[PDB]
Design a protein around this nucleic acid. Structure first.
Ligand SMILES: [Zn+2]
Ligand SMILES: [Zn+2]
Ligand SMILES: [Zn+2]
Ligand SMILES: [Zn+2]
Lengths: 1291, 680
RNA sequence: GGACUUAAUGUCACGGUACCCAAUUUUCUGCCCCGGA
RNA sequence: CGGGGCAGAAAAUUGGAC
């Protein structure tokens, strides 16, 4: 008779359940499921407190199981005293059933006994079992028990026995995944406790027979698991969150009052990222300010929240709080605001299923197993580390629904997608995910398996379950406790090629390069070969990649781990069991073993040297290796690249509108985040490009919905019923160290279509990476392909790769103006040979090029008559105005059957155009990145100096200017609507009726929706709700003599301009009695000599700082660029070709200084190609001149049909463009009068100051005073002179 | 609002068109989805509001929703339960509404009552009989007795009458109404007036009409439930009712889907058990003539044979179906469409050659086995050709199952070392069925053909040990043969060539003396035989051995494939490919547990590849029941090569396989062989 | 020392991967002439 | 006798499948 007190310690999180009476336990499914957990009971009605305990019956069950195993391992003996088989059966008659009714196998052995166990004598097994006692199924005095187990209580030894459940436990949800499809079902939830603070339980055990003490102690020392975690057994506030929620409600009310509600996700969940910065950013107010007038620009930080602005704000609230911390403050503010907004804004198949407990007659059996005598048992341990080669993600649910103790409704789900962490904000790998991945890989390696069933009257006997019943793992935590980053994701509408409705969400991911502990234990007779195959598959070494997939989002390449530093040891349970008991099997001391020398290992633990290498196991060669195949390639980009990032752009202090994407990478060495970020292109874009290309190729993108569809896309890329069979990864820049300035500053602006001046609130800039044709960027990535693909699918993938190589799909944003254009693709040499052979087969063969008959420089043959007023005056006497207005319409044709982007129609062409540009007058393309480039802002302050646009020291022309010029020309030709206009403006004299938008005609207003109809210009070039069908690229420099070298005081490659400022709309409209004339155009001349000669004392104390100095380009320079189009009709292509080159003696205008005769260029077409997409997979070819002339004639026919006249007959008429009035008027504006030997140099100048000018010459009195009064020039005469080209103002 | 009435009127067209059976289920599911989604959005838009008249429509559409969500399940759907459970909550709130209209309240109570009836049909613990009784009484109180226009009132009245509520005041209008089928009239006649003639006539008409109703229909469920209720009351009509229903079911089942198919409705096992019980009970009488008794026993054997023929499968398996070019593309799709349409029909509108059992060669004895689940009893029917007699007996199988499970569990861990439990299993088999060793049941010195049942298919019936001090084996005095069903026996005349074939594919050179003998055929692929190499024998040889592995499939019997040097030939492929093995003798190397999966229940209807070989035209197969060493297989192959005119039991007996007391390993290694096929 | 808090000849819950589907993108020329105490 | 404008606007922030 003795009383021993024992304590129990946990090393992993364990599980908790609510306590119910045995009679009432049948009503609750969760209580029936959790019958082997720890129990929790409330203390008072309507309470949130209580205390937890562990029943002694469960400990008794574990102890007797350990006794059975120990006796089995020693052939039914212990310390030389034999034991018998015991008893585990009862009769329904003459008695009653026990309360738990075992459902597993029982280890048995040979009796080897001579005396039947009775009340006078019994073996230690029959003493530990309450066989011959005075206590039965009813507890009466507790004294009759020969051996008694008491309840185990939590050690609240410190203080505050009033313990709350919210401070000990937390909620989580698990699920079951189907092997064949990859989807899940029948989830369930449980409770998880904290082992670091509440992990000790104390209880008492009473024993009254001295014939089983040693066996009981050994069994106590042999128990390894309890309540779902590894265990050891030894023998001795409201104010904060309330105020912040009130402030969040105040901010929501203010946002709704200001009519900015969808913007709330630009404040909330976007200021949450400040947890990665620290308090320094707010303590110094280094936020990127807003300029917007250089006085009080908001840049997100000036709001109307019923007080001061949002800048006289949390800088005064962090000081107020200073308690929860920066991280908690930002996180709680963001979460509260997001939840409030989601609440403000916003069928079947839930199927939460718990395994039932069966009850039927004849459903209980006793199955004994007798192992052979002489067999040996061992115990193997595997230790190592798991390294993340890619960002990972383990999913959880919203914390508002994970409160342990609490909980007419339909589906409504969030969009935040949190990640799993512990109470100290460290990263965690749960045991359930590792066990699931291991089971899946084991079933794959074996070749056969079973789908897990939950009823379980008899346990399964398949190949996988037998091995899985011997495998033990551990929970893993890291040493990194820093906030994670956020990935954004959208979807595209296949129709308009724009962002679709309800298509935004975000996920949280961890860094790449972290390491986690790894433990695995196996107990049995022989170490399997499938487990070795799985371990070798997971390991990485000498050019091999680890192939461990963990967690979710495997389709976008998230969570590929690698196993390293593997060590394998081995116990011997037939002669070294005392050492195993004494050392407790190294439970909870595995890192020491990972970092221990060979000589320091304790007795019984020896290294294992029989671990097979690769290529010698039959598995992993027929099952595991061909599972996933790797394809690697490099992409060369010869254009600036910009994958936009908004939150970073509005958070970092650079004060830039848009910046590039980058990520954080963890470094194993020195255990720190590498402070140099890495630029990359996200795997989501990589997947989307391939999916869209394949869908458009095979024509499955046009289907309305894919609920139960099984199209080709649903087979290759998966759908909501089955997972995807292709997995993508990231494209990372690899040659970033070869650039002296990796990023370039580029500016953009929008030009009004009426006054030729920059529009209001239309200025913006980008910060892309720097790429040039002679120095391109390099990106390297990969993707994986599953086995079982047919030849057609491989052909489709190869065709998609070839399409990407050719340049059909640019990367990033702003691809219509020359960004992200691909130059070539270089496949690696380790890809499968058949893939390379297919790439060679599908490579574009020799095109059907014309044998130099009519495939040379295509030059138009057309002569415009030109204006006759300057033709009859070769003495240069008349004076003309720099600009005139063009009037047409108003009758705009609109189309409703607009062409979608999701199909290559058979009767529509798609190709590319190559052209050259030649300059006639000096060209100026300013570079606004540096305002002091010539380095002359010293002795002369306030004088801006630019140079010519260049990337890596190569002169270029941006595609935006070319796109704008040709778009304006096409709009003028096709009498489309005004794309850019200043709707609101007022006019004053030295008080009008309406604004400038009221005088504009109704039909000429810009298109605002896809229902009314799209004019040809908007239908061809694009709108905010409709992506355009043409693309333009950058132009490079090929040859040319030099810059415009002069001889003065400044550098010879520079010039000083004059005064140009403030276009005045209130000049063509005298007072409220006239409508707008229309588009404004300039004229070609040679007035740039006046600036050149008046230089050198154009600067001598006449213009202090109103002028600028910039480099110039000389005549005879050549540039070359490309133009792309797809799904084009015939007359559309004809009009495009005609506008790209109207003919001879007609040119365009481009650059700065147009009213001074600067920037006149001519464009000629070098060639033209067109690829045809049919069932036979046709290739590209060069068209002859005849079909091009047919295209132009068809365009003329369409235009003359649009004219509406019926008197003029239609047919095969040679193209005379002077017949149409507005076309002739437009072409009169672009006539070059100094090209041939017909110099006829005119004189075009703005009117000079009245009497005190500098260049004013006596005579005609051309100043504004004479032509500014209604005595010498009536208003109607002024309007007529303005709306008539080449009209002299000399008289 | 003025929007609410127009929206309800527009959305009611789609919900009232749901009573049109013309539309296919694939479109019915989407139209009802749209008709439900137009209404459910109003809930999340107008939370805590509505006119309380469109509130009942949410529950009414939800009732019809659980018509297409029922399939794609194995044994019980988890969404059919959820649909009614959710529709109850969306009608409880409509009940609490204070509109106060008469017709609206009547319709709401009608919908609630029918939903509760369905819930009680599919779930009892969540809806007891008392609650249903009270709800139906309340529905009757409001005046839900419009029998002339709506069958829902008829269903409510029948359900109330079946519970014990007297309904004499509505019987006349219940009978008169034309919207009542035959079963409802039979129930009204039996449960109200206690009449028998009208009930017999009406349910006879119903059973006769049942011949043209697929097994997916609910009418089968109602019929079996009514027959079970009649049996519970100790009536007399059930004995004939069960037999007639079984006849109708057997006639209807003959649709010939790939020659072996079913649907797996919940019933069709209790129905067969009830028919068996009724026939046995009516045969237990002391009729003055014995010919009627012989006819009754022959009918019992006929019922057993009709049950044992085919096997059933579930939708998860019959969808994930390996395909061929001839049958899988057409017959499977037609069967699937027919079954689905039949399932979604009654919920919308209510309105070789088989031989002879007595054709056996002289000197043969046939034994038929049947395991009754309704009463937990065993049966054994024998027929003697010479004496022209039939007998039957009974036994208990509640501990034989446990002994077999113990043997299987020990064998799965210690293959050879589990030979001690085999002796115990054989002794238990001998003790449980003592009529095998009785001269009055099976005369000594004859041939025995076994036709076992579900879990008896895996027992070595030829190695039983008699229950005495020095009991002997069964095969010592007899010579046994096996057959999965009597329907697999066909007339066959031995007209074949005299060539031998070999097909070897293994991992190690365990067969070195083999593959080098002179007598092997020239079409042998001994060096890595492939799947299409088997299809190159077309001369009807006499012997053929295939030494290779096997792959086991746990759910689809059609997916188990024979392991070769290729992707493998499966059950469907072996039925659709091999055409040149008619009338020959086949020998397999060593596999009987590498193909069939382990079993957990008392039943199993899985088939091996030996039945596939029997289906293509082979006259007999010889295989090993469990894994043995290659020495015995090679010795048997050489013995079969040397001669074919000697029996197999003689070889087993002369090799000392009857020494189970001395060396259990010898018994284990020797009694593993058995012969499949009936020599006609 | 004890209830709140177990029942004893029978607890495979280490019997279940929060799992599947979606391109931060569409559109826009770093341009320029009359004035008002 | 005198004089600088613009340094972004407009939309999509979740839908389903179980
Ligand atoms: Zn004992
Ligand atoms: Zn299994
Ligand atoms: Zn599809
Ligand atoms: Zn337009």
């Amino acid at each position: 008779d003795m009383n021993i007190t024992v304590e129990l310690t946990f090393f992993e999180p364990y599980r908790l359940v609510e306590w119910f009476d045995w009679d009432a336990r049948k009503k609750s499914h969760s209580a029936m499921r959790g019958q082997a957990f720890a129990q929790w009971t409330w203390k008072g009605k309507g309470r949130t407190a209580g205390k937890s305990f562990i029943t002694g019956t469960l400990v008794r069950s574990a102890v007797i199981k350990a006794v059975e195993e120990l006796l089995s391992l020693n052939n039914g003996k212990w310390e030389g005293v034999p034991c018998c088989n015991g008893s585990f059966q009862t009769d329904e008659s003459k008695g009653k059933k026990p309360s738990f009714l075992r459902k597993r196998h029982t280890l048995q052995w040979q009796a080897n006994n001579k005396n039947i166990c009775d009340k006078e004598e019994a073996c230690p097994f029959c003493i530990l079992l309450g066989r011959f006692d005075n206590a039965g199924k009813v507890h009466e005095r507790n004294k009759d028990y020969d051996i008694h187990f008491s309840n185990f209580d939590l050690d609240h030894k410190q203080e505050k026995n009033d313990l709350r459940l919210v401070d000990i436990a937390s909620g989580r949800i698990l699920n079951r995944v189907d092997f064949d499809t990859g989807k899940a079902k029948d989830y369930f939830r449980t409770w998880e406790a904290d082992y670091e603070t509440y992990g000790t339980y104390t209880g008492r055990i009473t024993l009254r027979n001295e014939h089983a003490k040693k066996l009981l102690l050994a069994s106590l020392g042999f128990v390894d698991k309890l309540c779902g975690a590894l265990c050891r057994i030894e023998v001795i506030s409201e104010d904060h969150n309330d105020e912040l929620r009130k402030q969040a409600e105040v901010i929501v009310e203010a946002f709704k009052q200001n009519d900015k509600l969808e913007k709330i996700r630009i404040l909330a969940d976007a200021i949450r990222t400040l947890r990665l910065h620290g308090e320094g950013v707010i303590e110094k107010d280094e936020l990127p300010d807003g300029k917007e007038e250089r006085d009080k620009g908001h840049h997100l930080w000036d709001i109307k929240v019923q007080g001061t602005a949002l800048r006289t704000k949390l800088k005064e609230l962090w000081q107020s709080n200073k308690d929860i911390g920066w991280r908690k403050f930002t996180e709680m503010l963001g979460s509260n605001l997001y939840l409030i907004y989601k609440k403000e804004t916003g069928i079947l198949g839930d199927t939460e299923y718990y395994s039932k407990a069966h009850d039927s007659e004849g459903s209980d059996l006793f199955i004994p197993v007798t192992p052979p005598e002489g067999i040996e048992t061992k115990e193997w341990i595997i230790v190592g580390r798991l390294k993340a080669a890619t960002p990972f993600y383990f999913g959880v649910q919203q914390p508002s629904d994970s409160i342990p103790g609490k909980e007419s409704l339909v589906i409504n789900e969030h969009t935040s997608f949190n990640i799993l962490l512990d109470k100290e904000n460290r990263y965690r790998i749960p045991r359930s995910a590792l066990r699931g991945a291991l089971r899946r890989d084991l079933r794959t390696a074996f070749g056969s398996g079973c789908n897990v069933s939950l009823g379980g009257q008899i346990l399964c006997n398949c190949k996988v379950c037998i091995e899985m019943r011997r495998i033990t793992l551990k929970d893993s935590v890291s040493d990194f406790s820093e906030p994670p980053e956020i990935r954004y994701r959208i979807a595209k509408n296949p129709g308009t090629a724009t962002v679709e409705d309800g298509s935004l969400f975000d996920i949280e991911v961890g860094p790449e390069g972290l390491t986690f502990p790894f433990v695995l234990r196996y107990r049995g007779h022989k170490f399997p070969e499938q487990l070795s195959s799985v371990i070798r598959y997971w390991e990485e070494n000498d050019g091999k990649n680890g192939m461990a997939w963990l967690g979710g989002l495997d389709s976008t390449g998230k969570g590929r781990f690698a196993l390293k530093d593997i060590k394998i040891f081995e116990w011997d349970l037939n002669q070294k069991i005392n050492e195993y008991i004494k050392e407790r099997g190294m439970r909870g001391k595995e890192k020491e073993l990972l970092e221990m020398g060979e000589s320091s290992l304790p007795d019984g633990l020896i290294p294992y040297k029989f671990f097979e290498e690769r290529e010698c196991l039959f598995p992993y060669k027929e099952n595991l290796k061909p599972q996933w195949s790797e394809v690697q390639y490099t992409i060369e980009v010869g254009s600036p690249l910009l994958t936009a990032d908004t939150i970073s752009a509005l958070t970092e202090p650079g004060n830039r509108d848009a910046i590039a994407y980058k990520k954080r990478v963890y470094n194993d060495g020195n255990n720190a985040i590498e402070p140099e970020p890495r630029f990359a292109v996200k795997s989501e874009t990589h997947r989307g490009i391939f999916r869209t290309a394949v869908g458009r190729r095979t024509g499955d993108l046009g289907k309305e919905d894919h609920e139960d569809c099984t199209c080709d896309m649903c087979i290759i890329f998966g759908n909501e019923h089955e997972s995807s069979k292709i997995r993508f990864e990231d494209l990372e820049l690899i040659n970033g160290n070869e650039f002296e300035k990796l990023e370039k500053h580029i500016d953009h602006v929008a030009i009004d279509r009426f006054t030729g001046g920059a529009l209001d609130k239309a200025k913006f800039d980008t910060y892309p990476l720097a790429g040039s044709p002679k120095k391109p960027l390099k990106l390297k990535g990969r993707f994986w392909i599953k086995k079982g693909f047919s030849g057609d699918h491989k052909l489709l993938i190869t065709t998609a790769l070839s399409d990407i190589r050719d340049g059909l799909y640019p990367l990033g944003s702003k691809g219509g103006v020359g960004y992200g254009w691909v130059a070539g693709i270089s496949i690696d040499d380790n890809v499968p040979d058949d893939f390379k052979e297919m790439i060679n087969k599908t490579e574009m063969p020799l095109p059907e090029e014309v044998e130099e008959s009519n495939n040379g420089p295509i030059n138009n043959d057309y002569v415009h008559p030109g204006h006759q007023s300057p033709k009859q005056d070769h003495k240069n006497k008349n004076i003309y105005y720099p600009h005139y207005f063009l009037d047409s319409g108003s009758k705009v044709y609109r189309e409703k059957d607009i062409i979608t982007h999701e199909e290559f129609t058979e009767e529509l062409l798609s190709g590319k155009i190559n052209c050259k540009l030649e300059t006639l007058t000096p060209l100026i393309i300013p570079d606004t990145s540096d305002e002091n480039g010539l380095k002359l802002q010293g002795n002369k302050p306030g004088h801006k100096n630019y140079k010519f646009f260049n990337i890596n020291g190569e002169l270029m022309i941006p595609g935006s200017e070319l796109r704008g010029m040709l778009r304006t020309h096409f709009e003028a030709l096709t009498k489309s609507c005004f794309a850019i206009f200043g709707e609101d403006s007022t006019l004053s004299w030295r008080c009008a009726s309406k604004t400038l938008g009221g005088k504009l005609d109704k039909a000429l207003h810009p298109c605002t929706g896809l229902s009314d109809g799209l004019c040809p210009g908007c239908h061809l070039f694009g709108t905010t709700d409709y992506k355009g069908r043409v693309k333009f690229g950058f132009a490079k420099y090929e040859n040319g003599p030099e810059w415009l070298i002069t001889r003065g005081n400044n550098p010879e490659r520079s010039l000083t301009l004059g005064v140009l400022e403030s276009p005045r709309p209130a000049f063509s409209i005298p007072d409220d009695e006239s409508e707008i004339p229309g588009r404004k155009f300039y004229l070609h001349h040679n007035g740039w000599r006046i600036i050149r000669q008046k230089q050198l004392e154009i600067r001598e104390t006449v213009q202090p700082e109103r002028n600028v100095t910039t480099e110039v380009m000389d005549k005879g320079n050549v540039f070359s660029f490309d133009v792309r189009f797809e799904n084009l009709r015939e007359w559309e292509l004809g009009l495009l070709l005609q506008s790209l080159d109207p003919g001879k003696n007609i040119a365009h205008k481009l650059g700065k200084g147009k009213p001074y005769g600067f920037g006149s260029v001519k464009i000629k077409i070098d060639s033209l190609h067109t690829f045809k997409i049919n069932s036979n997979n046709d290739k590209i070819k060069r068209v002859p001149q005849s079909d091009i002339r047919e295209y132009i004639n068809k365009g003329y026919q369409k235009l003359i049909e649009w004219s509406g006249n019926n008197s003029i007959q239609k047919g095969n008429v040679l193209p005379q463009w002077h017949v149409i009035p507005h076309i002739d008027k437009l072409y009169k504006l672009l006539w070059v009068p100094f090209l041939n030997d017909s110099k006829l140099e005119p004189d075009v100048r703005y009117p000079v100051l009245n009497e005190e000018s500098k260049g004013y010459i006596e005579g005609s009195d051309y100043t504004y005073k004479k032509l500014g009064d209604k005595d010498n020039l009536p208003y109607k005469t002024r309007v007529k002179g303005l709306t008539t080209p080449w009209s002299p103002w000399n008289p | 609002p003025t929007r609410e009435d127009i929206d309800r009127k527009e959305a009611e067209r789609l919900l009232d068109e749901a009573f049109n059976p013309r539309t296919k289920p694939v479109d019915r599911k989407k139209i009802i989805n749209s008709a439900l989604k137009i209404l459910i959005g109003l809930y999340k838009e107008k939370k805590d509001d509505l006119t309380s008249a469109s509130f009942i429509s949410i529950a009414r559409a939800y009732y019809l929703v659980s018509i297409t969500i029922l399939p794609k399940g194995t044994t019980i759907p988890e969404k059919k339960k959820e649909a009614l459970r959710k529709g109850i909550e969306f009608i409880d709130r409509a009940i609490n509404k204070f509109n106060g209209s008469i017709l609206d309240s009547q319709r709401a109570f009608r919908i609630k009552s029918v939903l509760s009836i369905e819930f009680n049909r599919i779930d009892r613990e969540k809806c007891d009989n008392i609650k249903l009784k009270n709800l139906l009484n309340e529905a009757v109180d409001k005046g839900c007795t419009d029998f002339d226009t709506y069958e829902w009132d008829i269903q409510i009245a029948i359900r109330l009458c079946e519970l014990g509520v007297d309904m004499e005041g509505h019987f006349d209008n219940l009978i008169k109404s034309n919207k009542a089928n035959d079963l409802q009239k039979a129930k009204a006649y039996y449960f109200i007036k206690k009449d028998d003639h009208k009930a017999k006539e009406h349910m006879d008409k119903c059973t006769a009409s049942l011949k043209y109703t697929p097994c997916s229909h609910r009418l089968w469920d109602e019929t079996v439930g009514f027959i079970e209720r009649l049996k519970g009351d100790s009536s007399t009509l059930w004995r004939d009712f069960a037999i007639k229903t079984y006849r109708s079911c057997r006639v209807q089942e003959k649709e010939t889907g790939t020659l072996r198919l079913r649907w797996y409705w919940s019933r069709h096992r209790v129905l067969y058990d009830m028919a068996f019980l009724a026939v046995k009970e009516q045969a237990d009488d002391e009729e003055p003539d014995v010919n009627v008794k012989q006819a009754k026993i022959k009918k019992l054997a006929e019922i057993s044979d009709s049950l044992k023929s085919r096997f059933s499968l579930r939708l998860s398996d019959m969808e994930k179906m390996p395909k061929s070019d001839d049958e899988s593309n057409h017959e499977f799709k037609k069967f699937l469409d027919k079954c689905v349409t039949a399932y979604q029909d009654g919920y919308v509108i209510n309105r070789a050659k088989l031989l002879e059992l007595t054709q056996v060669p002289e000197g043969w004895v046939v034994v038929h086995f049947y395991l009754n689940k309704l009463e937990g009893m065993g049966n054994a029917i024998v027929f003697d050709k010479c004496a022209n007699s039939w007998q039957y007996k009974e036994f208990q199988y509640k501990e034989l199952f446990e002994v077999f499970l113990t043997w299987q569990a020990n064998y799965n861990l210690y293959k050879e070392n589990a030979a001690e439990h085999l002796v115990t299993l054989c002794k238990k088999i001998g003790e449980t069925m003592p009529f095998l060793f009785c001269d009055n049941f099976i005369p000594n010195g004859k041939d025995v053909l076994f036709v076992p049942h579900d879990f008896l298919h895996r027992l070595p019936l030829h190695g039983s040990i008699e229950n005495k001090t020095n009991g002997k084996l069964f095969l010592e005095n007899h010579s046994c043969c096996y057959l999965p069903a009597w329907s697999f026996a066909s007339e066959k005349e031995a007209s074949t060539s005299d060539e031998y074939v070999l097909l070897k594919n293994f991992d190690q050179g365990h067969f070195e003396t083999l593959q080098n003998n002179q007598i092997w055929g020239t079409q042998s692929v001994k060096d890595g035989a492939s799947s299409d190499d088997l299809e190159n024998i077309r001369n009807n040889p006499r012997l053929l051995t295939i030494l290779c592995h096997g792959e086991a499939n746990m759910s689809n019997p059609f997916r188990s494939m024979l392991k070769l040097a290729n992707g493998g030939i499966t059950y469907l492929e072996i039925l659709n490919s091999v055409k040149g093995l008619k009338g020959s003798q086949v020998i397999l190397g060593a596999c009987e547990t590498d193909l069939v999966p382990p079993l957990s229940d008392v039943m199993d209807e899985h088939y091996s590849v030996a039945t596939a070989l029997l289906l293509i035209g082979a006259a007999g197969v010889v295989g090993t029941m469990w894994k043995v060493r290659s020495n015995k297989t090679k010795s048997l192959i050489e013995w079969k090569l040397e001669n074919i005119e000697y029996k197999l039991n003689e070889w087993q007996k002369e090799t000392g396989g009857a020494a189970y007391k001395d060396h259990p390993p010898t018994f284990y290694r020797s009694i593993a062989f058995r012969s499949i096929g009936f020599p006609l």
